[PDB]
Amino acid sequence: ADFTIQDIRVEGLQRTEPSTVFNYLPVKVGDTYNDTHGSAIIKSLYATGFFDDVRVETADGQLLLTVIERPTIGSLNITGAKMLQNDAIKKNLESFGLAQSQYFNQATLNQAVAGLKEEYLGRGKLNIQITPKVTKLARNRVDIDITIDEGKSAKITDIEFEGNQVYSDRKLMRQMSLTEGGIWTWLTRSDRFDRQKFAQDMEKVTDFYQNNGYFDFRILDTDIQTNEDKTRQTIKITVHEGGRFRWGKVSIEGDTNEVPKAELEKLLTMKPGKWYERQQMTAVLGEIQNRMGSAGYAYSEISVQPLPNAGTKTVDFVLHIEPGRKIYVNEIHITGNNKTRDEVVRRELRQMESAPYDTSKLQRSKERVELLGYFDNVQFDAVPLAGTPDKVDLNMSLTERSTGSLDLSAGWVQDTGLVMSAGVSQDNLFGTGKSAALRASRSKTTLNGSLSFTDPYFTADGVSLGYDIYGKAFDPRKASTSVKQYKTTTAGGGVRMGIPVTEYDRVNFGLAAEHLTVNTYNKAPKRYADFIRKYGKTDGADGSFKGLLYKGTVGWGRNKTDSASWPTRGYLTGVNAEIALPGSKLQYYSATHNQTWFFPLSKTFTLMLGGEVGIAGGYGRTKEIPFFENFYGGGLGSVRGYESGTLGPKVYDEYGEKISYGGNKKANVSAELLFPMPGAKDARTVRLSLFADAGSVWDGRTYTAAENGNNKSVYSENAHKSFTNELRYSAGGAVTWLSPLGPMKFSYAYPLKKKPEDEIQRFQFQLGTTF
């Protein structure tokens, strides 16, 4: 019969609100209910899926919905689980979900598991058993435990190529990486069958055969057999070899754009040289896409269409270039700052903001950032903004230093010989966020090594804490030229704290104890004795000092400079003080100051201007800072064109040798004109100079003889140049190149005011590590 509904009662839910229904319903109170309403209403409530089963009961004017609802999920446990990890498949499972309480259902489950099974079938595991067990627990909810048993794995026995006929089954088999049973595959695992891997393998087996000239060449069938236990796997690959043939030409079709059909001259390079290599092709389209897209054209899909002159049998194509719009860059973002400053990277690089996108001006920025060695790779991702065209955002992904490492560094110091280093570090071991590293260097002269432990973060705004223990053996004997006849050796250790005050200014401290061992040997210069004489013992013949120094350290520096590689304007600065403190033997101090100002006269031409000033005394129980701690001079560090150390007071020793003391005061100043290669005119991987430097290193002491044998001709020579005398000048020009080994400085200087007593190196240089 029929009906007119005088009131409804939903009995079942608990809980889920009803009105959240009494509003779902096709009826109301007082509508006429018939039949169709009865099935349609349930079929309506079954969707939205809050219920496992409904039922519709019509009695004496009343409408009774009896609903069973549906459970929810208390927890889910996936445990096989080896070849891939549990919580990853549970994460991938809640993607359908199945998450906390999540309105459960079995269709979803059956297909989540069906998904798993195709994952495992995708990778090695051919047999596999993924067994859901779903237990209704309480009160309204349910708990799913997926339990896995993974199938060992399937391993390729044979790989067969049916039809070739041009190429060797062995060759082809070598083009793809996955393979039959090998003598070496336990490690490897090259026959751990894999789906995607086999996809790539067919891809390679294609590129080769394409880059080899054969157009056509379809792969027709791929037959993967197996056996009981699903362990051993044959693989059979059927193939149609191509023409081979043949190059036609050519360029165009289009297209009107800020760049011309001029491109087709250079960028089209290939000759109708017979065999067509798809490699060359995609490389050329690359070249095109790159020359397009600077100016603005990011997209600009190009469509090659083939012409089969076959029956010749040749093939030639035409590329239909279909650029579009243009793009401006709007904002620019940056990936990881751990151990680096996202501040500084954002500066040196081309492009930047609200500017027509250009490729070449991007990958020139990825050359720069990467030439700083800060990051071990870079990529450029373009996010086509918000929903408006001709505008794009940009975020460059950076990855750096790959925490923990081996380091191997070779270098060349001019006069000395080969240098080289090694080190290994680990950043944040192990979850402590504390760093530790062990480094050592060896040159004909110096042996150097240290062990250092640093808390990079010791304060919230990074404030460094460090400790290191080292030794240094410096044997200025050996080597070609000569600084003294002596050797000193230090073993010591210290505390250091860096303080990043502003984003320019860095202050740092340190305290240390060194155990100094000096050796005067000789027969050798006066001043070395009179040191041993006052401060040290004598076995000789030879002579030796021993004792320990307690040393304070202060540093500082400001860098306001437009770039790291290739600066223009800004300025550098530094201030540095060392003091051997009360309780040391010895007890001297040292200070210093740096300025480098740069100036941007032109776009090409940058004037660098700067100099260094330094002061070293001695105090208290010891006047006269030693001389193995002394300022030295000449060379690229101070005045190019002179030899290194040569600047300052010098005296002859026996064996007809001229050595140099150096001295307790330092002055240096320079002028540079820097500019790129002869264009370029902006771009620099290399930079050129013309310099004029005047340094001086003095003493304020007076010199007569001193062995046989006086080297000046007079007797005074004094020391001066602040009364102002001992100092040298020069000018000349320099290549500072950044190789892909190290920086490499060269230079050629004309010394001006050259005395006879003056030791002089016209051409100086130094290559790479340890400047």
mmCIF file of N, CA and C in Angstrom, residues 639-642 728-731 748-754 760-762:
data_model
loop_
_atom_site.group_PDB
_atom_site.id
_atom_site.type_symbol
_atom_site.label_atom_id
_atom_site.label_comp_id
_atom_site.label_asym_id
_atom_site.label_seq_id
_atom_site.Cartn_x
_atom_site.Cartn_y
_atom_site.Cartn_z
ATOM 1 N N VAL A 639 104.934 42.055 -1.068
ATOM 2 C CA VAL A 639 105.346 42.767 -2.268
ATOM 3 C C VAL A 639 105.727 41.779 -3.349
ATOM 4 N N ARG A 640 104.954 41.712 -4.422
ATOM 5 C CA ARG A 640 105.287 40.749 -5.449
ATOM 6 C C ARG A 640 106.623 41.190 -6.004
ATOM 7 N N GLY A 641 107.322 40.286 -6.665
ATOM 8 C CA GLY A 641 108.598 40.625 -7.262
ATOM 9 C C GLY A 641 109.826 40.395 -6.386
ATOM 10 N N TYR A 642 109.653 40.386 -5.068
ATOM 11 C CA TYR A 642 110.754 40.046 -4.183
ATOM 12 C C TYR A 642 110.595 38.592 -3.810
ATOM 13 N N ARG A 728 110.471 48.189 -0.066
ATOM 14 C CA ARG A 728 110.629 47.964 -1.475
ATOM 15 C C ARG A 728 109.299 48.226 -2.148
ATOM 16 N N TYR A 729 109.340 48.380 -3.469
ATOM 17 C CA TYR A 729 108.170 48.686 -4.273
ATOM 18 C C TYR A 729 108.158 47.743 -5.449
ATOM 19 N N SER A 730 107.023 47.678 -6.120
ATOM 20 C CA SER A 730 106.948 46.958 -7.375
ATOM 21 C C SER A 730 105.596 47.163 -7.993
ATOM 22 N N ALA A 731 105.505 46.738 -9.238
ATOM 23 C CA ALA A 731 104.296 46.871 -9.990
ATOM 24 C C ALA A 731 104.385 45.808 -11.051
ATOM 25 N N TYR A 748 103.545 38.757 -12.308
ATOM 26 C CA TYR A 748 104.851 39.209 -12.773
ATOM 27 C C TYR A 748 105.049 40.652 -12.392
ATOM 28 N N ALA A 749 106.086 40.904 -11.614
ATOM 29 C CA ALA A 749 106.243 42.197 -10.976
ATOM 30 C C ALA A 749 107.579 42.819 -11.360
ATOM 31 N N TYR A 750 107.578 44.122 -11.542
ATOM 32 C CA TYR A 750 108.843 44.790 -11.725
ATOM 33 C C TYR A 750 109.161 45.368 -10.376
ATOM 34 N N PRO A 751 110.234 44.883 -9.762
ATOM 35 C CA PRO A 751 110.736 45.530 -8.549
ATOM 36 C C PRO A 751 111.353 46.903 -8.871
ATOM 37 N N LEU A 752 111.023 47.922 -8.088
ATOM 38 C CA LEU A 752 111.532 49.264 -8.330
ATOM 39 C C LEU A 752 112.190 49.775 -7.064
ATOM 40 N N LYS A 753 113.385 50.357 -7.173
ATOM 41 C CA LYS A 753 114.318 50.444 -6.039
ATOM 42 C C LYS A 753 114.800 49.047 -5.571
ATOM 43 N N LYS A 754 115.595 48.425 -6.444
ATOM 44 C CA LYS A 754 116.276 47.150 -6.194
ATOM 45 C C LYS A 754 117.757 47.364 -5.845
ATOM 46 N N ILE A 760 115.405 38.608 -5.199
ATOM 47 C CA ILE A 760 114.361 38.999 -6.115
ATOM 48 C C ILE A 760 113.856 37.872 -7.033
ATOM 49 N N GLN A 761 112.542 37.648 -6.977
ATOM 50 C CA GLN A 761 111.828 36.681 -7.817
ATOM 51 C C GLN A 761 110.838 37.464 -8.667
ATOM 52 N N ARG A 762 111.032 37.477 -9.978
ATOM 53 C CA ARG A 762 110.221 38.301 -10.857
ATOM 54 C C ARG A 762 108.854 37.648 -10.976
#
